[PDB]
């Protein structure tokens, strides 16, 4: 078990390398085919039947998310037959390209693909592995880019933040609260992509870091919202300020660095005179903070820490590269004169 | 030609309401491997007549992963029936 | 470890013989010079048609007569 | 399709109120068809005459509001002074919303029906007037 | 034995999918696939390629279908039934079955029906379109699978098959 | 496009059977060598076998006299030689090994020819300059023109990154 | 054109005889077991990687050989390493 | 943009460089000075001016990274401006030579109150 | 995104199983082999944004090589040029 637990973990990133390093439609077929075969035993380890009744819902979704891709691949074999990763030379194929590929980056359609998976998994350790599946198909879209029907890609993005802004008003499961708002940032970096595909990854990098800090701060004891009442006066009061340092940043306020892509997202989006569409998104992003307020009101205000059981013992977790993470996640908004020069 | 039109309707046995529904859940996974050979042949039409001679490995290496993907999800339905005895996709407890 | 080959060959004498055929099979293609005769023949099998070329001045070698000593010598095999 | 909207802004211009709303009820007649599709698949299994969905009559609401959506224009765009103006096209928003106020009764739902539906109507002819584009390109 | 012998198998191959498209009490679903893929193997055996289709008997029709047929006995231990002997099965079997001949009914049976539904004429020998003759090397299609230039595929695909065993060496 | 007439057709095709055509098959091309390799350049180097129709008759004409030559002088051990290989099955060249010497005793003797053991069907040659080489090939319409580049001089930023306020 | 007229006699002969066998000359007027499942899955794994092993005799009349030599031996390695980890647990088989 | 898969090419030798003692290189690591204090503050140090080896090498991390990061950043605007000027220099019809007129021609609106 | 490791370090992952005319292990061409060799020559230094507006021609006959579309449209209407006059004579040609 502990030898191959690295080996299974090793081949996941081996999959997404082959997605990035190829000029061939059949290798990128294989690429996130073997990824979908490498995620399954991570879901299992304690062999609980709820984990099995979550992975199989995860399974046959991504099976079709594989198998629909190849149906697009044989069309531009019948249409000019070249296999370089380029324009698809058929709008009937590019339609079949994107809205199959959008399953693995789950949009406003394919609703319960995200929450029903992430809720019900006992492994709340991670399950940060669902950032890799946010990383691999974005590394195809940078190359599909100059042949899209241009209306389908923006329609899924306007709907993306519309449902994600609504989902967590009806929630206590902080996994589902973090399952939602993963639709939110995946609407923005699609909505840039017709206008300068560079600086899309700027939204991608900031989203990785502010989700990496979130579950590592959730790996103290908390899995339920009212369980985040009983740690300030029980586990550690130092965690209570630090969790307020991130939930307010990821809402996007300008003195923190969570606002930083949405600062730059308009400088690109206008100057190409699309005005009514960024205004509808930024006003929707107001609702992205009322998840966090009404959640930060619970942990930072000492809301009745009952159940007398005092932790006089020390803590030994594995906070691996943890304390160096919210130093570019708060105070980096002055520290990006050109993030669009090293990445772009 | 008409040999491309059929088979192209034969690809539309991947009807999604008959791909995860209803119960006797093996009938769902049935047409998944049944969605294979609608792509093994349809590729092998155009590769063969237009004498490519190099992409012959492509439908062969297709069927390598086609059973290998089909090998995985069949195992989990045993693990469904390990604690239950029947598949019955109307089984639902873990909600969203 | 010297009796380790004599306390398993008197214990499980099946896979012991397999590893000896796992051996003596990887090593020997890099040893005897009967190989690279395998390469000289497998390249000198004519499938397609040898199309001639156009002369312009030179003529470095090989005039039009096929039975002239103008090309290589693969006729060692018939003498072999 | 975009052939319907291409047949909308070109010919009538307030006039020809016989075929104005005949081109304008089709969008309203097609709009309830989309929500009827989810009302049988997301809402649970209905009676033995599917589609037999939960409240029903969604097309019966949608085709009526889309009928009066062009009708209140081509009457008022004919009778006041004969342009299409933001003040002129404002009037179609209020009473067209109150079918959703008449059905599913008022004082909490129909009271906002004239409220929100009118302001979003007047921006449309304002939108084509100043040269605005939603989906532009360089 | 006529000229239309290739196309007439393809239409039969369409209907093998419809035989299990609803719910054929899934033991006959195996008998929906063997009838299909064998005819599907017949379609590949035209056009030059002999070897590449016959393996689908071994690797899939002898390979996947047996293990497929090895299930639905170790699970689903209820009482099965012959399909079409109910009203839950035949409720849609005829619906796409009419269109399968209706698609053929006017693609070319009229003179010009019409513009985009009459582009492909039925027959007659342009379905093959394989002249002129070839070589004595192979089919070819005979020198088709090579451990020349494609080697990066084999090291990846073989190593993917290895870790497939380990995931099934565990939980089950 | 255009096609040549029904004339320059109906020339004397060698109406022989396939076994008697593969009977000799070895002394045939090993001594003619003038129109055939020129016809190969006429087909391989230059495509469109419609400017290339003439020498297909020339190599055909040489084979006409060729079987007429072997018929007049030594044909009795030839006629028995394709007799045994007519007894069919894969047309092996070791079943009729015995009768080969009775044919081949006089091909080097009566009319005096060669036994091309292994030197034939190899060793790519050159032939002769006969016709103009088809430069400016089949269409070769244009390249067309590329787009110009910049060489310049790598200076740093004019005032530095010029983004919103961002002095340096 | 008899392939296809070659087996049609063979299959019409079998279905004929049953009618003289089962028909007209008669006229009378599951528990699950895990150890019996994992061998079928194990077989199909070694059933795939012999089909990739399959194109060998055409892969000898070829170009430079040590590419085809050292790589074809590698599939047997992956077929054999797969045994050894599975050899650590076979069950009552 | 040619010669890909490079962190920074060998065409980047004409850089001043973006040297030390800028406030950014001061700032890159200034947060790292605050960062290592938090690493004490998580695991109940409780010192907050702790052992120097944990109090250091957060400083050594960002400072070498930040200087090695700024080298391509000034290069990237430079190569962005390196391409722009020639296309400005070419196509004179795409860059009109406008005539400047003084404030004797302009008759603006004119709107007083 | 496309990091292109194979450009700096000079090995090919594949790069050979890419187009219709690259390797052909015993020099056996394809049916539309003659138009690949022309269509690549058109837009090589072109940055693909004017290629859909500059070359525009060698892509067309190449695309119609792969289908023989209007050739099949031209040949089918011969069955309406003749073959509606079946009983109206015009055997044309007599055998052989
Ligand atoms: C041997 C290959 C190893 C590949 C390892 C890949 C690890 C997975 C990476 C996933 C996250 C990707 C983040 C993108 C930004 C990474 C930093 C970077 O810009 O390096 C790319 C750099 C800069 O790229 P570049 O300037 O050479 O050209 C590529 C341009 N982009 C990145 C836009 C596609 O690439 C390198 O040359 C490495 C140094
Ligand atoms: C002297 C430092 C304070 C006294 C020692 C620290 C003891 C401690 O652990 O308190 C942590 C405290 C967090 O507050 P809280 O968790 O709510 O309550 C716990 C009180 N024991 O408060 C904290 O110290 C949290 C750390 C704040 C963020 C790091 C700042 C470090 C400050 C020390 C360096 C001073 C210079 C930094 C400011 C520079 C400004 C230019």
XYZ file of N, CA and C in Angstrom, chain B residues 1 46 49-54, chain I residues 16 19-20 24-25 28 30-31:
48
model
N -20.546 9.305 -48.715
C -21.414 8.254 -49.228
C -22.404 7.783 -48.179
N -12.095 5.211 -43.123
C -11.361 6.262 -43.806
C -9.863 6.014 -43.807
N -9.254 2.937 -46.970
C -9.317 3.215 -48.403
C -8.315 4.289 -48.814
N -8.288 5.411 -48.104
C -7.242 6.412 -48.277
C -5.995 5.839 -47.631
N -5.095 5.312 -48.460
C -4.049 4.414 -47.989
C -3.025 5.165 -47.155
N -3.273 5.215 -45.851
C -2.434 5.993 -44.961
C -1.220 5.192 -44.524
N -1.448 3.917 -44.165
C -0.480 2.856 -43.869
C 0.247 3.098 -42.538
N -0.004 4.231 -41.890
C 0.674 4.549 -40.643
C -0.306 4.657 -39.485
N 5.827 12.041 -36.553
C 5.903 11.354 -37.832
C 4.518 10.916 -38.272
N 0.920 13.768 -40.687
C 0.296 14.143 -41.944
C 0.244 12.921 -42.851
N -0.356 13.117 -44.022
C -0.526 12.060 -45.006
C 0.780 11.673 -45.689
N 5.985 6.794 -44.767
C 5.609 5.768 -45.741
C 6.662 4.671 -45.850
N 6.690 3.721 -44.890
C 7.881 2.895 -44.604
C 8.520 2.129 -45.756
N 5.318 3.859 -50.173
C 4.021 3.592 -50.781
C 3.101 4.778 -50.492
N -0.112 7.737 -50.787
C -1.544 7.713 -50.557
C -2.263 8.239 -51.796
N -3.592 8.277 -51.752
C -4.357 8.705 -52.915
C -4.292 10.203 -53.152
